[PDB]
């Protein structure tokens, strides 16, 4: 019994007793912001030097951060805010979080236990309102139980689908000093089941029917380091076209012959295609986001006469089972890590040499369906895509990994078409809650995880707006992140929505932007302004050569849509696609109907 | 039934039907940010000439301008955001009006019918989140009930005590056309009990017995445009002492010799005083918050022992049953509005001319306890307290109102103490809840609620620095707000508990602050610096001369405790007192183990 | 009232605190609360679609449950599409007494201990006729297993599943309608059975069904 109880930490306070859990679970880096109730805790920590601390401006900051540095690292990243409006500020970042499954721990002071109910001076109900975003919260309520529920929060967050959990801290709880012993397993962090190995065999032999195969895989490959490889070995093993969502760019190498590029709402129109024709699809990690699967009645038809002939079908590799039959019915249904399971998976499979006919049609939709647009003319406004294409031809000349992040419109849309996508990680994007003012702080939290990476925050300057003071931290932290905003001087996203579905009625989407390089200024981080197409390339190389924070604004042309598009209620494959006289017409009719305004 | 039944909705889209409903709910200004979800409305009110629309850089900011604009015009803050992040983003300024009991009436758009429940493109669960953190909240499911879900919002956040409602609008309903006929009752917006009455009566017999009454006044007086005009009917009347809340000052004119000023944790010790010896306790809308009645079990011991003897005790005029003998016993409760109670009650009220006694005793109190604190000495920096005193005596020099928003910290409690305050709704801040960033975002809704008045935001540089994007948005809403931020360069209100409870401890309490006068420079805002005593007047000068929005940097005095204290635990009259020695030795001990870092 | 009566009905609480109820009211109220109280184009287009995929079945089944109980010319209208377009019927548990089980289209009650016929029917048809039913699992079997020839029709364009249902919460709930006819079944049948064609006989189907009959009794 003397066995089994842990005494030594006995006569530690429970912000002593956090600290030293905190070691115990290999966390390098907090991200917080203090307060009266989080007091004891931020004393605890007080000259730590067995983690870095990172101070934002605001703790919406602080929590997109924590999901960089969790996007970036594979860890899970730790935020520390105090009571009241504290915690209510992290709520954007835990549901982001939860939609993006981001391992996300955020401990929230609370008032001491003898004031909650009573309505107490920075008192909120965080774990009632915080219940919908996170997988599971917890109110500590004694100290001699915060190892415990630490632990529990921990492997939460980092099984099954990854995602947000909060702890509440009561400030009498963690100023209390452990007086009594407790169980030796909670001061310590932490085979395949016959149905999943019959589903398994009954895939690999779906799979070696299939004359049109494709793989659809997402941030689930992400989620462990052989993942990519296995990929890979599978896609070369039995010839396979792979085609990835916004969240799984980087699980695929994009130059690969066998690389459909993203699908979906805005993704390649040869993917799409694809998809729409396969008799087969391999979901890896993915869970058919409604951006992917176009109109669901009509998504996959050549898949589901396959399965209903036995010929074919959906195979779908996913770890929580809330996700499985969600939407598409799978044909074969395999649950747990895709990782794990391809390594079963895979050696059932038959090996392919050729699938002349196929990739015969593959290459053939991917020669009909480039990402193209309208080119810039002499003395036009650079293009926003023209932009992406020159920061990442100049980003690979370095011998450093490039991490991107982005805000969330139309710039977030051309960063991911016109990047080539290589590394698993590198794609650090708001795709299922899709929060504006995610870029900047998720670029300074991914710097941190990777002190040698380049860091490139493509934004908007509407989405840049939003958390702008976070710049200050980038200095403060000493991360050299590289900020690009594309001044388009509208929220062009929306004003693409209006110019299509509303007649060029642009209501409430042009707001001021300050003057980004006296912004800069201000916060002390270096400025480049790029107003021209001469300017652009040796603008660039200025902005990656910077060994310093650094802001590059770009004045880039307005009123450009996102093409392809697949419009809301239309069938994957029935996109709308770029045509130049088209997109003449369209100004045309813009500039009459808004009497020249646009 | 043809008189009952309306039919002049039919054909309109649910956004229409919601541009309509907000005129005949004499809705001027709204507050928001477009996005996907939230599309149909924002295409019904374009061009709008109806109402202002204010548009801020973050949901954050929306909100909290919301609420500026609600406290200084005493009407309902409509705020108009999307899906998602778009309402996840105001769930900081709903948590915070639900604890100030401000009226605002938030709509967010929502994903289609359709699509709700199935982890949507920009979903949250907003109706389940945000249900802790309003008075009520509802999603209409079809447009037939739009304009009854409007009025019964609106009815909702403006009766009881006031508070945030939140209406969630799919896509869908606001893009539907109504066609059929909805009761004409929905397309409209909208006695003294026995018991209460009879209350009434004993509380004015109770008062008729009193020989040491004081009147404890809040924000519940506000409430009614009659409220402070009644509270000085009584106080003249019966002859007796006013004291108000953080959330009450302005309620009674502080020039006026019955004025005991501000109670509580850092209120006057002669209020602090007064009331832990008066035998008669006239509350008048207030919740005796936990910053307010010190150690409950030892507040107000005379008045307690008063009503145990028949001869005194605690009256308390309140509105919402939930907070009637929620901390206190009451020895009557008065329910209802309290202006309208008011009415009833002083009639039944003595005329007393002369307290004697009790009036020695209040006037020897208020001399022995001023706001004292450490004067400027030759080449010191400006203090915090001074230049606050600097700008109240300047600003009434003006021939117009003067309407004080703040930060959070110990700027916002030498606000609160060394204006003089004579006027109802011109102290508009975070006061149950405490937001930082909360200011700017005020200033710019009350200031756009009164296009007359002088609006100042007495911010700190913390605080400030969570929201200073929002500087954009004064230039772009025409708000000529005056904001000064008071650089400490310190998180100073926290900083004070770490000298005070953790040994001059300061773990991350010390945020870098950009230059905010190239900070103003690029939002476009006139910028003025304070640097050195020499500088204070005509710089104030400058500030408040100001025609357009305008931003003076003040750098203060560091590590400077607001005084007096009632520390945690302790009875209302043990409060710790401005002493120069102590404040000299208190600079050695911090300078010693710091090692002269501070 | 107005909520337990309406969309799927279903129970719904009013509480009643005691001095309320004591209480008189003193005030004035408005006068629409002292008194208890068309088809859209997209229904419209489905039911038309409906019809068509209908009219191409070879071997179709009227799966038919509570919700055609909810209308007084529920069962009529049921009986007529039926007897319009040569259909057999089966119903849930929650259904018996929709259809007349002594006409030779009965089918009978079908699930884990109905009609093997029934069963068998429904693993056969080409077009299944949901009305008013929820696909409940005491129904269906095992659900990925569950109407293979409902299933091919669909993805050859000759058929599926025809959903009637009043709650959206219930449709593409537990298996992918073709075509989902969203409202009271009843009201929507009346415009679905005139643009069905009129059926004499289907000899191969009602042979199969009546075989099935026989050899699977009680
Ligand atoms: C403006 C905008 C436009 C967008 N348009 C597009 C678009 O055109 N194309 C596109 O693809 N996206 C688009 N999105 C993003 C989209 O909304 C989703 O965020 C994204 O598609 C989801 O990708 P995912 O399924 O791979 O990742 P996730 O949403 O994270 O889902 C991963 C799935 O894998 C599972 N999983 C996790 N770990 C494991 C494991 N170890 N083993 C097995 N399974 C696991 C998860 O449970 C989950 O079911 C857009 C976003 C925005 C803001
Ligand atoms: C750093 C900091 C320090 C603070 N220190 C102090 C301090 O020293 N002193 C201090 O006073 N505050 C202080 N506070 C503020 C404090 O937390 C509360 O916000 C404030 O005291 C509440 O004042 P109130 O009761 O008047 O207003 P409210 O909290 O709004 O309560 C008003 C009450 O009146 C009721 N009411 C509303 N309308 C009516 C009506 N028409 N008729 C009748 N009743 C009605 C309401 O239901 C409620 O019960 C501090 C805040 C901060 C951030
Ligand atoms: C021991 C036991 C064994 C059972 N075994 C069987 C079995 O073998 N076979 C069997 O059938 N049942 C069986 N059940 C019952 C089964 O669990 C369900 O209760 C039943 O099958 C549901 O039938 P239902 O879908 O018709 O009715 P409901 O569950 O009431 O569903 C009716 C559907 O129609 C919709 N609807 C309602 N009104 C309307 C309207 N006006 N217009 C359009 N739609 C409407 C409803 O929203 C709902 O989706 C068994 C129950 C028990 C206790
Ligand atoms: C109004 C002054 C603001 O400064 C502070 N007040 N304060 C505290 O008041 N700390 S406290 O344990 O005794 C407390 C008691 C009752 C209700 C709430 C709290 C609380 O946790 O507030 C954060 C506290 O810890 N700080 C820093
Ligand atoms: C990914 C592109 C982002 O741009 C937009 N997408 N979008 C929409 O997709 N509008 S939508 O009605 O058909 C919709 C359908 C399913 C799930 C969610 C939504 C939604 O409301 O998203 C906001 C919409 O309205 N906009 C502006
Ligand atoms: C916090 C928040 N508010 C609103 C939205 C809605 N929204 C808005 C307003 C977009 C426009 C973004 O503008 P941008 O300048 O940042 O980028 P682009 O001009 O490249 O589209 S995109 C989008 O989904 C959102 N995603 N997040
Ligand atoms: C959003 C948020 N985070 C944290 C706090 C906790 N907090 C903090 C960090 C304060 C310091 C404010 O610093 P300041 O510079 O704005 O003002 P002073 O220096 O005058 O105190 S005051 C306070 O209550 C808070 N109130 N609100
Ligand atoms: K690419
Ligand atoms: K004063
Ligand atoms: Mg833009
Ligand atoms: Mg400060």
Redesign the interface.
Known sequence: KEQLMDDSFIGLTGGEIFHEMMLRHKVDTVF?????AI?PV??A???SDKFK?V?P??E?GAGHMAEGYARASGKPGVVLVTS??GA??V??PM??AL?DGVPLVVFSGQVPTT?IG?????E??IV??????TKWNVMVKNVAELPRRINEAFEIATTGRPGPVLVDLPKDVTASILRESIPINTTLPSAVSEFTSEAIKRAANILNKAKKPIIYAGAGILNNEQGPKLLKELADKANIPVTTTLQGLGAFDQRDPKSLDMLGMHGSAAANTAIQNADCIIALGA?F???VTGNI?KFA?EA??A???GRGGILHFEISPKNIN??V?ATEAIEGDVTANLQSFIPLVDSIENRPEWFNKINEWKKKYPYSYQLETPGSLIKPQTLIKEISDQAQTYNKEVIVTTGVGQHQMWAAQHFTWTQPRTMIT?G??????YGLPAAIGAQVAKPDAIVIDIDGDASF?????E??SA??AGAPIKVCVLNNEE?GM?TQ??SL??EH?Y???H?????????A????VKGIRITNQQELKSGVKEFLDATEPVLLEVIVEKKVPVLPMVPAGKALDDFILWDAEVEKQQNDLRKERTGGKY
């Open positions: 917080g912001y203090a307060g009266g007091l931020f004393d920590i007080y000259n601390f101070l401006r605001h919406q009241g409006p209510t500020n709520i954007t549901a982001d939609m004031a009573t309505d107490a001076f920075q909120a109900d009632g309102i915080s219940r919908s975003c869970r986001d409604d951006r009645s038809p589901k006469l399965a209903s002939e969600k939407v019915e708001s299922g809650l899709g929060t504006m003012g707006n939003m958390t702008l003071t710049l200050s200095v403060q929220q929306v929505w209006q579905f509303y009625r209501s409430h989407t707001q001021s932007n300050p003057d980004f390089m006296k912004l200024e201000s916060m002390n």
